[PDB]
């Protein structure tokens, strides 16, 4: 949407910012949901272009086929390289919902 | 316990909560926007895993992680407001 040089330009506040020093799972429904199966994400795979997340099995089934686009925002998915596993998101999910 | 989520919601660079979380797409590692943008001003390597970004302008490979920001705001109630207050204090002192 905006030029790159605008998107990542830091404000005067941001050029001097200092760290921010370090409830119910029910309210996180939308954030942890797979847009395809509508269930909580498993084996999360994330698109490099748009950072949209899907269950591994879900996005693989979708891509084949397909149209080779992100199911959420329609952006092109040029290749197999366009997706990558997101183990850190799985671990966050696991801490939110322990087994 | 909010403390238990720290590893998955803090910045590897500044060690604080992720603020405007921003992801290096090639290796999917996430940092504060300011932290990673400023790091990239004189490096092409992911600060966490050392993977080198292949573009001349490393900013091309950054994406804001809006989903993660929303999760963090719900896991750390008050954070959204504390950072807005922090910014307000800066501008009030300089304006």
């Amino acid at each position: 949407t905006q030029p790159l040089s605008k998107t990542w330009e830091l404000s005067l506040y941001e050029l001097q910012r200092t760290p921010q020093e370090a409830v119910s799972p029910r309210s996180l429904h939308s954030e942890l949901m797979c847009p395809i199966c509508l269930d909580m994400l498993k084996n999360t795979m994330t698109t490099k272009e748009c950072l949209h997340r899907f269950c591994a099995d879900c996005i693989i089934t979708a891509l084949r086929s397909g149209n080779k686009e992100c199911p959420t925002c329609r952006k092109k998915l040029v290749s197999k390289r366009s997706l990558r596993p997101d183990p850190n998101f799985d671990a966050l999910i696991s801490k939110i919902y322990p087994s | 316990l909010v403390k238990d989520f720290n590893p998955y919601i803090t910045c590897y660079i500044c060690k604080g909560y992720l603020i405007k979380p921003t992801t290096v797409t090639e290796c999917l590692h996430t940092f504060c926007k300011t932290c990673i943008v400023q790091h990239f001003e004189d490096s092409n390597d992911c600060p966490r895993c050392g993977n080198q970004v292949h573009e001349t302008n490393p900013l091309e490979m950054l994406r804001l992680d809006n989903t993660l920001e929303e999760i963090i705001f719900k896991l750390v109630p008050g954070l959204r407001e504390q950072e807005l207050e922090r910014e307000s204090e800066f501008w009030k002192k300089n304006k």
Partner: protein, 148 residues
């Protein structure tokens, strides 16, 4: 049964967050066959109308689109006498992240803003383009005649 699982989740989602002016659900305990209702959008000449649709989900939903058609007759350049709907996302532009909620909302937007340069009923598209007054008049008339 992944399709059935997906359909059930949608049903639960609809109960929690219903689309404005629309409803949908199974006809007589066949999960793969639903009826929907769309109230005529306020902005449009379908205002006051109650419009019924039939929905048939395929066995590999949501990876193939559902078949969605009007059972209530309606005067519209993108909906024909069979109740077939010319809407990108129902065919060429379907995505497995779409849901019935989203489809109904798109149909409402279509009722508010027709696409005469992609019709199903030429004469209606012609009339919509060249004489809006007449299109509105007949739309309203059909709404009173058929959309009780």
């Amino acid at each position: 049964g992944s399709a059935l699982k997906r359909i059930n989740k949608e049903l639960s989602d609809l109960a929690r967050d219903p689309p404005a002016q629309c409803s949908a659900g199974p006809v007589g305990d066949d999960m793969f066959h639903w009826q929907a209702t769309i109230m005529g959008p306020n902005d449009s000449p379908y205002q006051g109308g109650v419009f019924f649709l039939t929905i048939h989900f395929p066995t590999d939903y949501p990876f193939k689109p559902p078949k969605v058609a009007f059972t209530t007759r309606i005067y519209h350049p993108n909906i024909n006498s069979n109740g077939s709907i010319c809407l990108d996302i129902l065919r060429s532009q379907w995505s497995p992240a779409l849901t019935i909620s989203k489809v109904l909302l798109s149909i409402c937007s279509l009722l508010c803003d027709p696409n005469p340069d992609d019709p199903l009923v030429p004469e209606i598209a012609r009339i919509y383009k060249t004489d809006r007054d007449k299109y509105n008049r007949i739309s309203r008339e059909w709404t009173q005649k058929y959309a009780m």
